[PDB]
Write a protein that binds this ligand. Structure first.
Ligand SMILES: CCCCCCCCCCCCCCCCCC(=O)OC[C@H](COP(=O)([O-])OCC(O)COP(=O)([O-])OC[C@@H](COC(=O)CCCCCCCCCCCCCCCCC)OC(=O)CCCCCCCCCCCCCCCCC)OC(=O)CCCCCCCCCCCCCCCCC
Ligand SMILES: CCCCCCCCCCCCCCCCCC(=O)OC[C@H](COP(=O)([O-])OCC(O)COP(=O)([O-])OC[C@@H](COC(=O)CCCCCCCCCCCCCCCCC)OC(=O)CCCCCCCCCCCCCCCCC)OC(=O)CCCCCCCCCCCCCCCCC
Ligand SMILES: CCCCCCCCCCCCCCCCCC(=O)OC[C@H](COP(=O)([O-])OCC[N+](C)(C)C)OC(=O)CCCCCCCCCCCCCCCCC
Ligand SMILES: CCCCCCCCCCCCCCCCCC(=O)OC[C@H](COP(=O)(O)OCCN)OC(=O)CCCCCCCCCCCCCCCCC
Ligand SMILES: CCCCCCCCCCCCCCCCCC(=O)OC[C@H](COP(=O)(O)OCCN)OC(=O)CCCCCCCCCCCCCCCCC
Ligand SMILES: CCCCCCCCCCCCCCCCCC(=O)OC[C@H](COP(=O)(O)OCCN)OC(=O)CCCCCCCCCCCCCCCCC
Ligand SMILES: CCCCCCCCCCCCCCCCCC(=O)OC[C@H](COP(=O)(O)OCCN)OC(=O)CCCCCCCCCCCCCCCCC
Ligand code: HEM
Ligand code: HEM
Ligand code: HEM
Ligand code: HEM
Ligand code: FES
Lengths: 74, 379, 164, 56, 239, 52, 379, 55
């Protein structure tokens, strides 16, 4: 698993630059915000609905406890 | 003639386990939790020892000794609340780690997965015995309830329960043996974590895409050391916020009352990280069935490598499976909340439905949905 | 390179501050706690001792030695073998109190507690290796090479006294 | 540049780097403690013991 | 059934970086001294903790000297009285725990060393419970010797109304109105439960500033080292 | 060992590493002073003695 | 298909450890003690746990608790005296192991030798801290004396002893810290022993003859497993003799007395295994000289690889060195006998002579004898 | 009140003197050692105890 017998590649070229030549925050907000918005758009329609229905269930149960708790006119 | 880093035996092990270990280039922030738990473990041990040097595991003095720690020991309160909230953080990171493993199809690592399940069980046992030590009202009565749980097992039953109790019920002897078991267990956890890492290293790691990353491995030291250091700094931020701004946020106030066995507190709930099991306990009317469901809730993680049927290791390219997983997570929070609440008409039915859904998603919905996805994707 | 390493240097400085203020927490925790930080102010009183009677109490986790210096020693032992006596000391140099000499209860040979009212004179005889001590704490015969150190006697008004 | 002078005067050698870090921490501890204590006392002015020792 | 949760009062220490008003702590200790200590008990805190918080060393030692405390065996094994010292915990009004119930109707007064941190709700409860006494509503009769308090669970407390206006005289001279007494004693009880409160807030301020400094820098270091990989440009040239 | 390390090239190496080793020792001394909060030394440096 | 023993990573480590490890066929019985130490360690840990489950760590209820272990706990006296005498067996095996290392030149394996010295330091520290726990007269006064020794350290001596004491004498704080460190330390010993075995396996064991045994090697399993089993049975026989027939043979009767800080025992002595160093410190008059000689008495094992000058590794073929080694052993027994005896003529002179002769043999007589040895064999 | 009642099986052996200081005061000033461990706390055991009592 050590380096040397991981896999086999051919005709693959990797260009890279020194960390001392690039800026560690290249367009942090110019490109970061659109990417975060795109990721949120991709994920929200799958992650939100279970949590929103959990919130509905929690509120409903919390209100249900009181009226069963409340005084019954009799 | 040769670098010491990869020639000295201990240095060789450290090198090929933390420095030159080939790791996937695109592991997300979730993988960082694997480090945090370990750090939490050390933070649990190193802080915990410093409580053991002023804690007397005696019924007549345990609570008084803890109050002495928090009021008279120099910076003792920091150690005590750091320990408690660090245990809470440990469980948070543990749950997030299990979620990461389940999501990105990591349970194909089998041996590592089973070792992780064993570690999880040991950690829950450790926290259970730990909560008893302050000998508060909630500590005492939660210990009473959880130990009385074991009376449901057939035949042996009460004999096993009294064997654990060291008597007719929880008392001085029970406190002392809980303290000793609590001291020993985390070192077993450390050895098991070493075995977990050993098993994991033979195959590498699961990247978020789920495909083999042998074509993009990078050395661990330059990148992931600093990445996990940033993660540990974030975890320290959260933990220190909890300790220094709301120390008892995740903690019942009644534990600040000396344990009086003649008064049942109005509410008897375990620590926040046990409620999901306890709620399942409340769901099953039968006591034996309740205990079996409680243990099966955690044991079901072993069945996961057998219940995976989709031809894709990860869940990154599987939308309906993603929706099912997030429904499972929401069900887990629902179970936690239900366990927090008492047992009345609004909550009993919700607990039953939540438990049924929690088992159904893992055992039924997820595999059938994986079949549906495989069929939908022409394979 | 200067900017990039300045980031690292400031990070390391902050980490050093945090590491000190974290390790110091534990180290100070392992020091003496606040409850035992209420010491050295024992409110014992001298109205239970005439010449020869030799009560000993507990203080700082060690015995102390409350003894009315006998009417003999105050006048003779202040000049009995003042030459060497294995250690040079004069009686009122030990304590400003001329009738209520007080000492610590550790015999200064190896670490022990000399039992009171015994010895060839009869002040303090160390049960361990003999080494009798004079009724004011002086050493003349015995393996003990030094006299009892006298705690700072902050004698209060009237009978009540403070040691340490 | 000031940064370049700082680098190739006091940053190139890792041992000089360590000495710089040590002295910087020595001064930073005092500076940070003073500043944080002053701020915290300013927020709770009149509500601490040190602000009412004069009365008693 | 039902219980009335205490409203969230605007305490001086409610703020994220706020500290207990130590003058109010001194007044609350006065209240405990001449009101609550008569029947209620506090053990885990001692006169020593008073110095540097609400009383000076001379005042604290005078306060300790005022009370009489039982000591160890005498020269023959007697239980001799002794003027209390700074290293003495606050005296317990009733010797055995059952004697407290016997003197009262039968409910023992809980110790206040943690009552703020043990009761769900915090000071808002302990405050309101004192300033919440009212005549019982119609249709619910209370036993003789019992008192109706909406905030206390069960709505049936065994307290004689402890705090009423003009009960004690503060040394400072502030008005002794019942609300003032309740607020000051509640602040003192909060201090009793959490002596390290002010120090905790100070360290929290230090932690907030230190992390707001470190986290951007460590993130910058991470970005620096990872920028080799976040800017790499691959290329594929099969023959 | 007693003579193998005693050589002109070894002496020159010692001279080469004298600044590095000496100021590493200075690093350690200052770090020890800072960590232990040694008043006997810190009482002389200005603006730091105000802490005590 | 692969053999699970040689393919499963856990079973692979076990296999390379003590299943197929090439060991010399001619190693004498003196090697068995190594395993015995580990066995003793394991036994100790077990007994320790069952002692920590009924032992409070408060000055008020320490000694009584121990009596409750002996008088009330079902089969409690057996566990207590098993621990007490297993400590002595542990130290007997430790001393015999050190002697074996000195004799057959096993200290030439440098890393294992240094790790063993660290293990020795940790074992004596652990045993000393354990002896304080019963809170008898001997425990209290021995802890007082030993920690008072640290006051001889220049500048930072008094602060260090006050810090370790957690106050101004041996009291509740010191007892609780000693309990916590006694709990944790044996796990550190276990880790260090694992490191010891790791370092040993990279070079293989040394035979009595000293010559490399690479040509004559046997698998560890079919022979040395049963040989160490027999050794463990014999050590169990001896330890059980001690526990069942004379439980307090190697124990000062004064320990069965509540620790009264106002009354010293007429004679104060450590346990037997600590006397050899204790008498050494008794020899040196100067207080700091005593501490320096105390630490040197054990740290001098570090210089053994450097002081070696004979062309032959072992000592089977060096008669003069053999007489020197047995002189050293007799001198060690002399120091052990003297330490218990009170300081008084002639024991002062005999102790001083014994310490001087011990150091003279270790540093001077042995290397000079080896140099003379080489000339007699034309090398 | 700290009332009175006949001892039962679970009760430990009676203690004559309330506090050890009272025990010292009642005698010449010495403390009668607890006999629960005397044999195995003194060098000599039953031999020493017999010799002390009858010697
Ligand atoms: C709970 C337990 C405690 C916490 C455990 C944390 C474990 C992980 C620790 C490491 C970590 O954060 O890894 C994730 C991740 C690793 O990627 P990265 O180094 O941020 O680089 C950007 C990514 O490539 C992704 O880049 P991008 O495509 O999103 O666009 C660039 C960039 C720009 O977008 C943003 O910065 C987001 C908008 C806010 C500005 O994105 C980010 O920075 C995303 C992270 C949010 C900041 O880092 C963060 O999430 C940053 C943490 C917050 C900044 C530091 C504190 C201020
Ligand atoms: C703007 C609207 C809200 C956006 C964030 C909420 C959301 O659902 O975003 C989903 C959106 C899409 O998810 P994704 O990036 O495809 O999947 C998550 C990455 O695989 C794994 O995460 P990542 O490595 O790409 O980004 C790390 C991220 C989040 O890091 C984590 O989630 C792990 C550690 C923090 C756990 C939660 C603490 C609260 O860091 C932060 O959000 C800021 C610093 C948080 C503490 C250090 C990490 O992700 C983000 O906006 C950032 C990550 C999630 C933030 C929560
Ligand atoms: C050795 C390095 C100096 C240690 C030391 O005592 O520093 C002074 C500081 C504080 O002392 P100080 O600087 O106030 O003056 C020296 C005081 N004596 C002589 C009592 C030590 O020491 C400590 O804080 C802990 C000492 C032990 C450290 C190990
Ligand atoms: C609330 C959840 C956390 C906040 C961020 C939102 C989120 O989790 O989004 C889901 C995210 C999506 O991204 P990805 O992992 O690539 O999945 C395929 C996307 N097409 O996928 C993930 O984040 C998956 C992470 C799974 C493990 C952590 C979450 C579960 C924790 C359970 C406890
Ligand atoms: C601890 C040290 C001893 C244990 C580890 C070393 C021994 C090998 C592993 C345990 C063992 O005995 O396994 C037996 C068997 C192995 O499989 P088998 O097909 O019999 O043989 C070929 C593959 N080894 O595996 C089995 O599971 C056999 C069936 C169960 C036992 C009957
Ligand atoms: C013990 C009495 C028996 C004994 O040890 O006899 C000596 C014997 C020598 O054995 P061998 O080396 O084969 O002799 C070759 C002779 N040409 O055997 C030996 O020399 C082996 C015994 C010495 C080395 C093993 C360790 C034990 C040493 C004595 C106690 C060590 C602890 C105290 C001193 C440190
Ligand atoms: C080794 C640690 C103990 C040194 C010996 C000693 O006597 O230390 C004294 C003292 C312990 O703490 P102390 O000052 O007594 O606490 C008072 C109440 N807070 O020591 C101290 O307060 C500090 C002693 C120095 C070690 C801790 C601080 C530096 C930690 C490393 C920082 C850099 C990384
Ligand atoms: C697996 C990691 C650990 C977890 C999850 C854990 C959990 C806990 C918890 C929840 C408490 C209760 C804290 C409170 O209620 O205030 C506790 C207390 C305690 N733990 Fe642990 N613990 C861990 C490791 C350790 C270790 C290694 C030790 C021994 C060195 C230890 C010793 C103690 C002691 C002495 C207490 C009582 C102190 C107190 O009152 O808080 N713990 N632990
Ligand atoms: C004691 C707590 C635990 C510790 C200290 C721990 C430690 C680690 C560490 C450091 C990693 C590597 C980092 C990573 O991949 O995230 C890891 C990976 C893993 N752990 Fe855990 N773990 C713990 C609990 C668990 C649990 C409860 C499970 C699930 C049953 C588990 C299963 C896994 C899996 C499957 C991986 C591989 C993930 C991957 O690399 O893709 N672990 N563990
Ligand atoms: C914690 C106690 C110790 C344990 C559990 C332990 C464990 C072992 C074991 C199992 C062996 C292999 C069997 C043998 O050759 O005896 C061994 C070998 C060895 N140990 Fe230890 N050991 C301990 C203490 C020490 C000490 C105190 C030293 C000396 C400083 C030491 C030095 C050695 C040496 C030199 C060998 C190699 C002997 C040879 O190859 O012939 N060990 N150790
Ligand atoms: C390295 C192995 C160990 C050694 C050499 C050792 C040594 C000792 C010794 C000499 C005593 C005093 C016995 C007596 O005076 O009666 C003792 C007591 C004790 N040890 Fe250990 N011990 C070891 C491991 C452990 C462990 C792992 C634990 C915790 C699980 C433990 C817990 C105790 C306790 C609670 C006592 C007090 C009971 C008693 O003194 O009889 N020990 N130990
Ligand atoms: S200790 Fe008193 S004479 Fe040796």
């Amino acid at each position: 698993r050590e380096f040397g017998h991981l896999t086999r590649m051919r005709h693959v070229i990797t260009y890279s630059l020194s960390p001392f030549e690039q800026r560690a925050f290249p367009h942090y907000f110019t490109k970061g915000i659109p990417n975060v918005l795109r990721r949120t758009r991709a994920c929200i329609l799958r992650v939100a609905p279970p949590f929103v229905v959990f919130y509905l269930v929690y509120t409903w149960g919390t209100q249900e406890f009181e009226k069963s708790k409340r005084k019954n006119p009799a | 003639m040769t670098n010491i880093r990869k020639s000295h035996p201990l240095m060789k092990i450290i090198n090929n386990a933390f420095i030159d270990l080939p790791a996937p280039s695109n592991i997300s922030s979730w993988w960082n939790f694997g480090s945090l738990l370990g750090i939490c473990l050390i933070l649990q041990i190193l802080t915990g020892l410093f409580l053991a040097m002023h804690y007397t595991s005696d019924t007549t003095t345990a609570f008084s000794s803890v109050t002495h720690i928090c009021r008279d020991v120099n910076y003792g309160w920091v150690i005590r609340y750091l320990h408690a909230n660090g245990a809470s953080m440990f469980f948070i990171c543990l749950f997030i780690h299990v979620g990461r493993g389940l999501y990105y199809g990591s349970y194909m690592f089998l041996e590592t997965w089973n070792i992780g399940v064993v570690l999880l069980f040991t950690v829950m046992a450790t926290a259970f015995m730990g909560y008893v030590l302050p000998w508060g009202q909630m500590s005492f009565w939660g210990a009473t309830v959880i130990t009385n749980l074991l009376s449901a097992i057939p035949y042996i039953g009460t004999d096993l329960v009294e064997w654990i109790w060291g008597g007719f019920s929880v008392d001085k002897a029970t406190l002392t043996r809980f303290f000793a078991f609590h001291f020993i267990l985390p070192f077993i956890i450390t050895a098991l974590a070493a075995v977990h890492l050993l098993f994991l290293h033979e195959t590498g790691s699961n990247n978020p895409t789920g495909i083999s990353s042998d074509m993009d491995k990078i050395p661990f030291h330059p990148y992931y050391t600093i990445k996990d250091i940033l993660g540990a700094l974030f975890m320290m931020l959260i933990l220190l916020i909890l300790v220094l701004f709301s120390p008892d946020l995740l903690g019942d106030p009644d534990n600040y009352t000396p344990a009086n066995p003649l008064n049942t507190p109005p509410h008897i709930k375990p620590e926040w990280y046990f409620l999901f099991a306890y709620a399942i306990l409340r769901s099953i009317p039968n006591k034996l069935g309740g205990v079996l469901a409680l243990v099966a809730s955690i044991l079901i993680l072993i069945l996961m490598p057998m219940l995976h049927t989709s031809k894709q290791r990860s869940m990154m390219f599987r939308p309906l499976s993603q929706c099912l997983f997030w429904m499972l997570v929401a069900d887990l929070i629902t179970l936690t909340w239900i366990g927090g609440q008492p047992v009345e008409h609004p909550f009993i039915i919700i607990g039953q439905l939540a438990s049924i859904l929690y088992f159904l998603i893992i055992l039924v919905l997820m595999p059938i949905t994986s079949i549906i996805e495989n069929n939908l994707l022409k394979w | 390179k200067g900017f990039s390493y300045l980031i690292t240097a400031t990070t390391t400085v902050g980490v050093a501050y945090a590491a000190k203020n974290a390790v110091s927490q534990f180290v100070s925790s392992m020091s003496a706690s606040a409850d035992v930080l209420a010491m050295s102010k024992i409110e014992i009183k001298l109205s239970d001792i005439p010449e020869g009677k030799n009560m000993a109490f507990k203080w700082r986790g060690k015995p102390l030695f409350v003894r009315h210096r006998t009417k003999k020693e105050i006048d003779q032992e202040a000049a009995v073998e003042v030459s060497q006596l294995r250690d040079p000391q004069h009686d009122l140099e030990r304590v400003k109190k001329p009738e209520w000499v007080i000492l610590i209860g550790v015999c200064t040979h190896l670490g022990c507690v000399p039992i009171a009212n015994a010895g060839d004179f009869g002040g303090y005889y160390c049960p361990c290796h003999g080494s009798h001590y004079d009724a004011s704490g002086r050493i003349r015969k015995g393996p003990a090479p030094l006299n009892l150190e006298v705690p700072t006697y902050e004698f209060t008004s009237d009978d009540l006294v403070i040691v340490g | 540049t000031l940064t370049a002078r700082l680098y190739s005067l006091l940053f190139r050698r890792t041992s000089t780097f360590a000495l710089t870090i040590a002295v910087g921490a020595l001064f930073f501890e005092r500076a940070f403690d003073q500043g944080a204590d002053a701020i915290y006392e300013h927020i709770n002015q009149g509500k601490l013991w040190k602000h009412i020792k004069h009365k008693y | 059934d039902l219980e009335l949760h205490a409203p969230s009062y605007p305490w001086s220490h409610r703020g994220l970086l706020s500290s207990l008003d130590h003058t109010s702590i001194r007044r609350g200790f006065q209240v405990y001294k001449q009101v609550c200590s008569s029947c209620h008990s506090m053990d885990y805190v001692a006169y020593r903790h008073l110095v540097g918080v609400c009383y000076t060393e001379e005042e604290a030692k005078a306060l300790a000297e005022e009370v009489e405390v039982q000591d160890g065996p005498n020269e023959d094994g007697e239980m001799f009285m002794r003027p209390g010292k700074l290293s003495d915990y606050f005296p317990k009004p009733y010797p055995n725990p059952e004697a407290a119930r016997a003197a009262n109707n039968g409910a023992l007064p809980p110790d206040l060393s943690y009552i703020v941190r043990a009761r769900h709700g915090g000071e808002d409860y302990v405050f309101s419970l004192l300033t919440g006494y009212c005549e019982p509503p119609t249709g619910v009769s209370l036993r003789e010797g019992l008192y109706f308090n909406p905030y206390f669970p069960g709505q049936a407390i065994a307290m004689a109304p402890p705090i009423y206006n003009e009960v004690l005289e503060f040394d400072d001279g502030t008005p002794a109105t019942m609300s003032q007494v309740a607020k000051d004693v509640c602040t003192f009880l909060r201090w009793a439960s959490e002596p390290e409160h002010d120090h905790r807030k100070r360290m929290g301020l230090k932690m907030l500033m230190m992390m707001g400094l470190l986290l951007p820098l460590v993130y910058a270091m991470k970005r620096h080292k990872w920028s080799v990989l976040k800017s790499r440009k691959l290329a594929y040239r099969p023959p | 060992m007693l003579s193998r390390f005693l050589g002109p090239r070894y002496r020159e190496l010692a001279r080469n590493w004298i600044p590095t080793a000496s100021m590493w020792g200075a690093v350690g001394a200052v770090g020890l002073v800072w960590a232990t909060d040694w008043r006997l030394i810190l009482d002389w440096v200005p603006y730091i003695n105000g802490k005590f």
